[PDB]
């Protein structure tokens, strides 16, 4: 019994090719560059996911001291003074509190400063 | 009995090694190691310096009895 490759290879190739949407040029049309681009793209997808965690970390922080200094203290002497205010621990995305309710972020500034005295 | 439902004893047939055929195992170089005289093959049980040649004490015949302990 002979068992030629037919239908198998086209199906595999077409699944690779379909992963290529708006890939530029022969990235979208030739199988070999499509598959090769996907190897490097693997690298990027995994690394980036882990990194995106750390990137939103950064955006968080960068808003929080901007509001903090608007109230006359930096990030450092703030997220300290909430933690030194101990039970105050809300921590996760204080960014949004600073970015939408300033009546609240002002009270948190007063709390941190009271804790540092 | 159902021939659909015949089943060989588990463990009595194992599958052949399919050497080649992926990076899911046994990639590129087959079972083999890389370079070297491992390639289309030959040469037997021989070390190709000096094969432990010990001397020879010899007598050709024999004939032995059938045993009934």
């Amino acid at each position: 019994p002979r068992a030629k490759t037919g239908i198998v290879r086209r199906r595999r190739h077409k699944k690779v090719l379909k992963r290529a949407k708006g890939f530029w040029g022969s990235r979208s049309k030739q199988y070999r560059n499509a598959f090769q681009t996907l190897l490097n793209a693997a690298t990027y997808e995994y690394r980036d996911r882990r990194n995106k965690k750390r990137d939103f970390r950064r955006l968080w922080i960068q808003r929080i001291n901007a509001g903090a200094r608007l109230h006359g203290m930096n990030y450092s002497t703030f997220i300290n003074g909430l933690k030194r205010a101990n039970i105050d621990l809300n921590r996760k995305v204080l960014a949004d509190i600073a970015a939408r309710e300033p009546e609240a972020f002002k009270a948190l500034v007063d709390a941190s400063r009271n804790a540092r005295q | 009995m159902k021939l659909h439902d015949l089943k060989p004893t588990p463990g009595s047939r194992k599958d052949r090694k399919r050497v080649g055929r992926g990076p899911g195992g046994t990639d590129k170089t087959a079972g083999r190691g890389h370079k070297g005289q491992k390639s289309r093959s030959g040469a037997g049980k021989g070390a190709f310096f000096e094969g432990g040649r010990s001397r020879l004490i010899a007598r050709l015949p024999k004939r032995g009895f059938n045993n009934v302990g």
Binding site: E45, K92, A104 | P23
Partner: protein, 98 residues
């Protein structure tokens, strides 16, 4: 405003059905109790432990299984290419509490 502090469940203030990591006990009406970490009511803020005594009731809605991803991984010149599937379970919970 209200959001899971995605370490597990603890949160601030305001009521709206939302996703979370799985909650063990199922069906509905888990009524799962929630402990305040912040509140803004009447825009009258109360926070940290003082607010934490405040309750937040919330019923369980549905168990789920969020959208699929692939864990695919690659290294160079070494034949290291591996592909696997993954899918995270979750738990809708409808906010309701004080």
């Amino acid at each position: 405003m209200f959001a899971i502090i995605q370490t597990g469940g603890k949160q601030y203030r305001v009521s709206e059905g939302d996703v979370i990591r799985v909650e063990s006990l199922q069906g509905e009406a888990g009524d799962k109790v929630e402990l305040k970490a912040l509140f803004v009511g009447g825009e009258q803020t109360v926070f940290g432990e003082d607010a934490g005594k405040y309750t937040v009731q919330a019923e369980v809605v549905e168990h789920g299984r969020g959208k699929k991803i692939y864990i695919r991984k690659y290294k160079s010149g070494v034949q290291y290419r591996r592909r696997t599937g993954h899918r995270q379970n979750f738990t809708a919970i409808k906010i309701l509490g004080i």
